[PDB]
Amino acid sequence: MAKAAAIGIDLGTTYSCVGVFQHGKVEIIANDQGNRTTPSYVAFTDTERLIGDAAKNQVALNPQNTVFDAKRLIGRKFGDPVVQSDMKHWPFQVINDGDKPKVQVSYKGETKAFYPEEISSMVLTKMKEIAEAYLGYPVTNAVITVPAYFNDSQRQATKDAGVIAGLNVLRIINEPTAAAIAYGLDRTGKGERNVLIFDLGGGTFDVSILTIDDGIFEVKATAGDTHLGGEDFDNRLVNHFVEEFKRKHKKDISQNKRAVRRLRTACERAKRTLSSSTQASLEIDSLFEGIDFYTSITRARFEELCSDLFRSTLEPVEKALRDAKLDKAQIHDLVLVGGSTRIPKVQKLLQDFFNGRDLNKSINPDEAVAYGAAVQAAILIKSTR
Ligand SMILES: Nc1ncnc2c1nc(Cl)n2[C@@H]1O[C@H](CO)[C@@H](O)[C@H]1O
């Protein structure tokens, strides 16, 4: 029953996803708000602790006590130049506890501090409860994914987050490995298979090259930009609409925090519409000083606003190919991961760089990692018996 059941968890920087392999198929489990992905946010309020969508929806009103990006801190030392550089951009306090970073917040009127693994365990507990509500029974066995560049300390801290959350961690697997498993790329029989995983998420870009030799996976190269993702494209849209409001009304909205946030959420939504339509409309009642902002943007204009950012995704692809010592024609499969890979211009650029090659994109890219982890969790729990 419960002891023979296992889940796959994609514990992401900005979003998390949970899957279960049963009756010959993977089911990506929707949360209580009907969403197949849940924000990796934890809010501490005057009465409660919020996780996911409810935490993300109140980030504007409570920025000092809403934690996100815990994956950027997990398994790292306080003195690490990555930690020191990132701290300058977060609205929450990061403190030092014996060369280990802790996030310090106000919760139920008291000052509390949490280790990154305790923050990640609260996200994992939510993913576990989403699976339990769908299954009708508690599930405790899980496969958790990590980026392929995570070292031993980051992997151990992720496993510890799993233990705190009440999960029995069957295995910690690499995100590009879970993605290749989702597409069945490890069941092609004999001979070495070279796979490139192009992972463009909300806040990070990762390129991974894997060799699959008779079921055995090997990471040949990892490249990317830890500070490039979907949120940079939303900000390019925001800047355009701030300048358009200034041309139509002779009023600068940039300093009005509420106006910029409402514009940012509308831009994120418009950006998503632009993946399946050639135009999107913005409908913001009383954006600033009682002025409604009813406008539209074409896909062509959006592609111009982000042109330099889209083109920059090809330098890590080339860098990963030289590090792996492979030419383009030596790559057998191209796999898309992350919601931003739905952008048609991103797909066109990658396909043209690989000389008109077909892309593996039939599995929802923001769900492919949880899908593969769910498949691996089923295989592992069966062998355990
Ligand atoms: N249809 C879409 N067109 C463009 N971007 C998308 C789309 N869906 C998601 Cl999710 N994202 C973005 O992917 C990230 C999460 O993986 C977020 O930045 C989200 O906006």
Coordinates of C-alpha atoms and ligand atoms in Angstrom, one line a residue:
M1 CA 0.0 0.0 0.0
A2 CA 1.9 3.1 1.4
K3 CA 5.2 1.1 1.9
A4 CA 5.2 0.1 -1.8
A5 CA 4.5 3.7 -3.0
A6 CA 7.1 6.3 -3.9
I7 CA 7.0 10.0 -5.2
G8 CA 9.3 12.0 -7.3
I9 CA 10.0 15.6 -6.2
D10 CA 11.5 18.4 -8.3
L11 CA 12.7 20.8 -5.5
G12 CA 13.3 23.9 -7.6
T13 CA 14.8 27.3 -7.0
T14 CA 11.5 29.2 -7.7
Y15 CA 8.9 26.3 -8.3
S16 CA 8.5 22.8 -7.0
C17 CA 6.6 19.9 -8.6
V18 CA 5.5 16.4 -7.4
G19 CA 4.8 13.3 -9.5
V20 CA 3.7 9.7 -8.8
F21 CA 4.1 6.7 -11.2
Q22 CA 1.1 4.4 -10.9
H23 CA -1.0 2.1 -13.1
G24 CA 1.6 2.5 -16.0
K25 CA 1.5 6.4 -16.1
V26 CA 3.0 9.4 -14.4
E27 CA 0.5 11.8 -12.7
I28 CA 1.8 15.3 -11.9
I29 CA -0.2 16.1 -8.8
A30 CA -2.1 19.4 -8.7
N31 CA -2.0 21.4 -5.4
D32 CA -5.3 22.5 -3.5
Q33 CA -5.4 25.6 -5.9
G34 CA -5.3 23.3 -8.9
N35 CA -1.7 24.2 -9.9
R36 CA 0.7 21.4 -11.1
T37 CA 3.7 23.5 -9.8
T38 CA 4.0 25.2 -6.4
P39 CA 6.2 28.3 -5.7
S40 CA 9.2 27.5 -3.4
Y41 CA 8.2 30.3 -1.0
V42 CA 7.7 30.2 2.8
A43 CA 6.0 33.3 4.5
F44 CA 6.0 33.9 8.2
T45 CA 3.1 36.0 9.4
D46 CA 1.5 37.3 12.6
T47 CA -0.7 34.2 12.9
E48 CA 0.7 31.5 10.6
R49 CA 3.3 30.0 8.3
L50 CA 2.3 30.0 4.6
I51 CA 3.9 27.7 2.0
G52 CA 3.6 28.0 -1.8
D53 CA 0.9 30.0 -3.6
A54 CA -0.5 31.6 -0.5
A55 CA 3.1 32.7 0.5
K56 CA 3.8 34.1 -3.0
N57 CA 0.5 36.0 -3.1
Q58 CA 1.4 38.1 0.0
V59 CA 5.2 38.7 -0.8
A60 CA 4.4 42.5 -1.5
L61 CA 2.8 43.1 1.9
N62 CA 5.4 41.1 3.9
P63 CA 8.8 41.1 2.0
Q64 CA 11.1 40.8 5.1
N65 CA 9.4 37.6 6.3
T66 CA 8.8 35.8 3.0
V67 CA 11.7 33.5 2.2
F68 CA 12.6 32.2 -1.3
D69 CA 15.9 31.1 -3.0
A70 CA 16.8 28.7 -0.2
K71 CA 18.3 26.4 -2.8
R72 CA 20.9 29.2 -3.4
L73 CA 22.0 28.9 0.2
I74 CA 21.6 25.1 0.9
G75 CA 24.9 23.3 1.7
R76 CA 27.0 26.5 1.5
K77 CA 29.1 28.4 4.1
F78 CA 28.2 32.0 5.1
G79 CA 31.6 33.3 3.8
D80 CA 31.1 31.7 0.4
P81 CA 31.3 34.6 -2.2
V82 CA 28.0 33.3 -3.8
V83 CA 26.2 33.7 -0.5
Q84 CA 27.8 37.1 0.2
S85 CA 26.9 38.4 -3.3
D86 CA 23.3 37.0 -3.2
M87 CA 22.5 38.5 0.3
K88 CA 22.7 42.0 -1.2
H89 CA 19.5 41.2 -3.3
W90 CA 17.2 39.5 -0.8
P91 CA 14.7 41.4 1.4
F92 CA 15.0 38.9 4.2
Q93 CA 17.8 38.8 6.8
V94 CA 20.6 36.2 6.4
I95 CA 22.8 35.7 9.5
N96 CA 25.9 33.7 10.3
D97 CA 25.7 30.7 12.8
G98 CA 29.1 29.1 13.0
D99 CA 30.0 29.8 9.3
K100 CA 26.5 28.5 8.3
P101 CA 23.9 30.8 6.9
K102 CA 20.5 31.1 8.7
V103 CA 17.5 33.1 7.5
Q104 CA 16.2 35.4 10.3
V105 CA 12.5 36.3 10.3
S106 CA 9.6 37.6 12.5
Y107 CA 7.0 34.8 13.1
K108 CA 4.0 35.1 15.4
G109 CA 5.6 38.3 16.8
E110 CA 8.9 36.5 17.7
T111 CA 12.3 36.6 16.1
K112 CA 13.2 33.1 14.7
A113 CA 16.1 31.9 12.5
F114 CA 16.1 28.9 10.1
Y115 CA 18.7 26.8 8.4
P116 CA 18.3 26.6 4.5
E117 CA 17.5 22.9 5.0
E118 CA 14.7 23.7 7.4
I119 CA 13.2 26.1 4.9
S120 CA 13.5 23.5 2.1
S121 CA 12.0 20.9 4.4
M122 CA 8.8 23.1 4.8
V123 CA 8.5 23.2 0.9
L124 CA 9.1 19.3 0.9
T125 CA 6.4 18.8 3.6
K126 CA 3.9 20.7 1.4
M127 CA 4.8 18.5 -1.6
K128 CA 4.4 15.4 0.6
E129 CA 0.9 16.7 1.8
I130 CA -0.1 17.4 -1.8
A131 CA 0.7 13.8 -2.8
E132 CA -1.0 12.4 0.4
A133 CA -4.2 14.4 -0.4
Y134 CA -4.2 13.0 -4.0
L135 CA -3.4 9.4 -3.0
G136 CA -5.7 9.1 0.1
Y137 CA -2.9 7.7 2.2
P138 CA 0.5 8.9 3.5
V139 CA 3.5 8.4 1.2
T140 CA 6.9 8.6 2.7
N141 CA 9.4 7.2 0.1
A142 CA 10.7 9.9 -2.3
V143 CA 13.3 10.6 -5.0
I144 CA 14.5 14.2 -4.8
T145 CA 16.4 16.0 -7.6
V146 CA 19.3 18.4 -7.5
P147 CA 21.2 20.4 -10.2
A148 CA 24.1 18.3 -11.7
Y149 CA 26.7 20.8 -10.4
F150 CA 25.7 20.3 -6.7
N151 CA 28.7 19.0 -4.7
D152 CA 28.5 16.5 -1.8
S153 CA 27.7 19.1 0.8
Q154 CA 24.6 20.5 -1.1
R155 CA 23.4 16.9 -1.8
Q156 CA 23.7 16.0 1.9
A157 CA 21.8 19.1 3.0
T158 CA 19.1 18.3 0.5
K159 CA 18.8 14.8 1.9
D160 CA 18.6 16.3 5.4
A161 CA 15.7 18.6 4.2
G162 CA 14.0 15.3 3.1
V163 CA 14.6 13.7 6.6
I164 CA 13.2 16.8 8.5
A165 CA 10.1 16.7 6.2
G166 CA 9.5 13.0 7.1
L167 CA 10.5 11.5 3.8
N168 CA 12.6 8.4 3.3
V169 CA 14.9 9.6 0.6
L170 CA 15.4 6.7 -1.8
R171 CA 18.0 8.7 -3.9
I172 CA 19.2 12.2 -4.7
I173 CA 19.3 12.3 -8.5
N174 CA 20.6 15.0 -11.0
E175 CA 17.9 17.2 -12.6
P176 CA 19.2 16.5 -16.2
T177 CA 19.3 12.7 -15.4
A178 CA 15.6 12.8 -14.3
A179 CA 14.8 14.8 -17.5
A180 CA 16.5 12.1 -19.8
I181 CA 14.6 9.3 -17.8
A182 CA 11.3 11.2 -18.5
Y183 CA 11.9 10.8 -22.3
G184 CA 13.0 7.1 -21.9
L185 CA 16.6 8.0 -23.2
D186 CA 18.2 5.3 -21.0
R187 CA 16.2 2.5 -22.7
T188 CA 17.6 2.7 -26.3
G189 CA 19.6 -0.5 -26.0
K190 CA 23.3 -0.6 -26.7
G191 CA 25.8 2.2 -27.6
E192 CA 26.7 5.5 -26.0
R193 CA 24.0 8.3 -26.3
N194 CA 24.9 12.0 -26.0
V195 CA 22.1 14.1 -24.6
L196 CA 21.9 17.9 -24.2
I197 CA 19.4 19.2 -21.6
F198 CA 18.6 22.9 -22.1
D199 CA 17.0 24.1 -18.7
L200 CA 15.7 27.7 -18.7
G201 CA 13.7 28.3 -15.5
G202 CA 12.4 31.3 -13.5
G203 CA 15.7 32.5 -12.2
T204 CA 18.4 30.1 -13.5
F205 CA 19.7 28.8 -16.8
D206 CA 21.5 25.4 -17.0
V207 CA 23.0 23.4 -19.9
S208 CA 23.9 19.8 -19.2
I209 CA 25.6 17.2 -21.5
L210 CA 25.1 13.5 -20.5
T211 CA 26.4 10.3 -22.0
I212 CA 24.1 7.3 -21.5
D213 CA 26.1 4.1 -22.0
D214 CA 23.9 0.9 -21.5
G215 CA 21.7 2.4 -18.7
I216 CA 24.7 4.1 -17.0
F217 CA 24.5 8.0 -16.9
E218 CA 27.7 10.2 -17.0
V219 CA 27.8 14.0 -16.8
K220 CA 30.3 15.3 -19.5
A221 CA 29.7 19.1 -19.0
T222 CA 27.6 21.6 -17.2
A223 CA 27.4 25.3 -18.2
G224 CA 25.0 28.2 -17.7
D225 CA 24.0 31.4 -15.9
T226 CA 22.7 31.1 -12.3
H227 CA 21.2 34.6 -12.7
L228 CA 19.3 34.2 -16.0
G229 CA 15.7 33.2 -16.3
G230 CA 12.0 34.0 -16.9
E231 CA 12.0 36.8 -14.4
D232 CA 14.6 38.8 -16.5
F233 CA 12.1 38.7 -19.4
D234 CA 9.2 40.0 -17.2
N235 CA 11.5 42.9 -16.1
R236 CA 12.2 43.7 -19.8
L237 CA 8.4 43.9 -20.3
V238 CA 8.0 46.0 -17.1
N239 CA 10.6 48.6 -18.4
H240 CA 8.8 48.8 -21.8
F241 CA 5.4 49.5 -20.1
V242 CA 6.9 52.0 -17.7
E243 CA 8.2 54.0 -20.7
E244 CA 4.9 53.6 -22.6
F245 CA 2.9 54.9 -19.6
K246 CA 5.4 57.9 -19.5
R247 CA 4.8 58.6 -23.3
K248 CA 0.9 58.5 -23.0
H249 CA 0.5 60.3 -19.6
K250 CA 3.8 62.2 -18.9
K251 CA 4.0 60.4 -15.5
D252 CA 6.8 58.3 -14.1
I253 CA 5.4 55.2 -12.2
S254 CA 8.8 53.4 -11.4
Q255 CA 8.9 54.7 -7.8
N256 CA 5.3 53.5 -7.0
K257 CA 6.0 50.0 -5.5
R258 CA 2.3 48.9 -5.9
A259 CA 2.1 50.1 -9.5
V260 CA 5.4 48.3 -10.5
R261 CA 4.3 45.0 -8.7
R262 CA 0.8 45.0 -10.4
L263 CA 2.5 45.7 -13.7
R264 CA 5.1 42.9 -13.1
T265 CA 2.4 40.2 -12.4
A266 CA 0.4 41.4 -15.5
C267 CA 3.7 41.2 -17.6
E268 CA 4.4 37.6 -16.4
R269 CA 0.8 36.6 -17.5
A270 CA 1.2 38.5 -20.9
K271 CA 4.6 36.8 -21.5
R272 CA 2.9 33.4 -21.0
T273 CA 0.0 34.3 -23.5
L274 CA 2.7 35.3 -26.0
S275 CA 3.9 31.6 -26.1
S276 CA 0.7 30.6 -27.9
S277 CA -0.7 33.9 -29.3
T278 CA 0.9 36.7 -31.5
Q279 CA -0.4 39.4 -29.2
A280 CA -1.4 39.8 -25.5
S281 CA -3.4 42.4 -23.8
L282 CA -2.7 44.2 -20.4
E283 CA -5.9 45.2 -18.5
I284 CA -4.9 47.1 -15.3
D285 CA -7.7 49.1 -13.7
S286 CA -6.4 52.3 -11.9
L287 CA -2.6 51.5 -12.3
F288 CA -1.4 54.9 -11.1
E289 CA -3.3 58.1 -10.0
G290 CA -6.6 56.5 -11.2
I291 CA -5.4 55.9 -14.8
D292 CA -6.3 52.6 -16.3
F293 CA -3.6 50.9 -18.3
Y294 CA -5.3 49.0 -21.2
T295 CA -2.7 48.2 -23.8
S296 CA -1.3 45.3 -25.9
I297 CA 2.0 44.0 -27.1
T298 CA 2.9 41.7 -30.0
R299 CA 5.2 38.7 -29.8
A300 CA 7.6 40.5 -32.3
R301 CA 8.0 43.5 -29.9
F302 CA 8.5 41.1 -26.9
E303 CA 11.2 39.2 -29.0
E304 CA 12.9 42.6 -29.6
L305 CA 12.8 43.6 -25.9
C306 CA 14.5 40.2 -24.9
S307 CA 16.6 39.6 -28.1
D308 CA 20.1 40.0 -26.3
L309 CA 18.9 37.7 -23.4
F310 CA 17.6 34.9 -25.7
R311 CA 20.9 35.0 -27.8
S312 CA 23.0 34.8 -24.6
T313 CA 21.6 31.3 -23.9
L314 CA 23.8 30.0 -26.9
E315 CA 27.2 30.9 -25.3
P316 CA 26.8 28.2 -22.5
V317 CA 25.6 25.7 -25.1
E318 CA 28.8 26.2 -27.1
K319 CA 30.9 26.2 -23.8
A320 CA 29.3 22.9 -22.7
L321 CA 30.0 21.4 -26.2
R322 CA 33.8 22.4 -26.1
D323 CA 34.1 21.2 -22.4
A324 CA 32.5 17.8 -23.3
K325 CA 34.8 17.8 -26.5
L326 CA 31.7 17.1 -28.7
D327 CA 30.7 18.7 -32.0
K328 CA 26.9 19.6 -32.6
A329 CA 26.4 16.5 -34.9
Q330 CA 27.6 14.2 -32.0
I331 CA 24.6 15.1 -29.8
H332 CA 21.8 12.5 -30.3
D333 CA 19.0 14.2 -28.2
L334 CA 18.0 17.8 -27.3
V335 CA 15.7 18.0 -24.2
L336 CA 13.8 21.2 -23.0
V337 CA 13.3 21.8 -19.3
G338 CA 11.8 24.8 -17.5
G339 CA 8.7 26.9 -18.3
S340 CA 10.7 29.6 -20.2
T341 CA 11.6 27.0 -22.9
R342 CA 7.9 27.3 -24.1
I343 CA 8.9 30.7 -25.6
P344 CA 8.9 30.1 -29.5
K345 CA 11.9 32.4 -30.1
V346 CA 14.0 30.4 -27.6
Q347 CA 13.1 27.1 -29.4
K348 CA 13.8 28.6 -32.9
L349 CA 17.3 29.8 -31.7
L350 CA 18.3 26.4 -30.2
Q351 CA 16.9 24.4 -33.2
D352 CA 18.8 26.7 -35.7
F353 CA 22.0 26.3 -33.6
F354 CA 21.6 22.5 -33.9
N355 CA 21.0 22.9 -37.7
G356 CA 17.2 22.4 -37.8
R357 CA 17.1 19.5 -35.3
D358 CA 13.9 18.3 -33.6
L359 CA 13.5 19.1 -29.9
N360 CA 12.1 16.8 -27.1
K361 CA 9.4 19.0 -25.7
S362 CA 6.2 16.9 -25.5
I363 CA 6.4 16.6 -21.7
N364 CA 5.5 20.0 -20.0
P365 CA 9.0 21.4 -19.5
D366 CA 8.3 22.7 -16.0
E367 CA 7.1 19.1 -15.1
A368 CA 9.8 16.8 -16.9
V369 CA 12.1 16.6 -13.9
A370 CA 9.3 15.5 -11.5
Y371 CA 8.1 13.1 -14.2
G372 CA 11.5 11.3 -14.4
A373 CA 12.0 11.4 -10.6
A374 CA 8.5 9.7 -10.3
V375 CA 9.6 7.0 -12.8
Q376 CA 12.9 6.4 -10.9
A377 CA 11.1 6.4 -7.5
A378 CA 8.8 3.6 -8.9
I379 CA 11.8 1.5 -10.2
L380 CA 13.7 2.0 -6.8
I381 CA 10.7 1.2 -4.5
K382 CA 10.0 -2.0 -6.6
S383 CA 13.6 -3.3 -6.3
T384 CA 13.4 -2.6 -2.5
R385 CA 10.1 -4.7 -2.3
Ligands
LIG1 N1 3.9 29.6 -21.4 C1 5.0 30.1 -20.9 N2 5.7 31.0 -21.7 C2 6.7 31.6 -21.1 N3 7.3 31.5 -19.9 C3 6.6 30.6 -19.2 C4 5.5 29.9 -19.6 N4 5.0 29.0 -18.6 C5 5.8 29.2 -17.7 CL1 5.8 28.4 -16.2 N5 6.8 30.2 -17.9 C6 7.8 30.7 -17.0 O1 8.7 29.7 -16.6 C7 9.2 30.0 -15.3 C8 8.9 28.8 -14.4 O2 9.6 27.6 -14.8 C9 8.5 31.3 -14.9 O3 9.5 32.3 -15.1 C10 7.3 31.4 -15.8 O4 6.9 32.7 -16.0

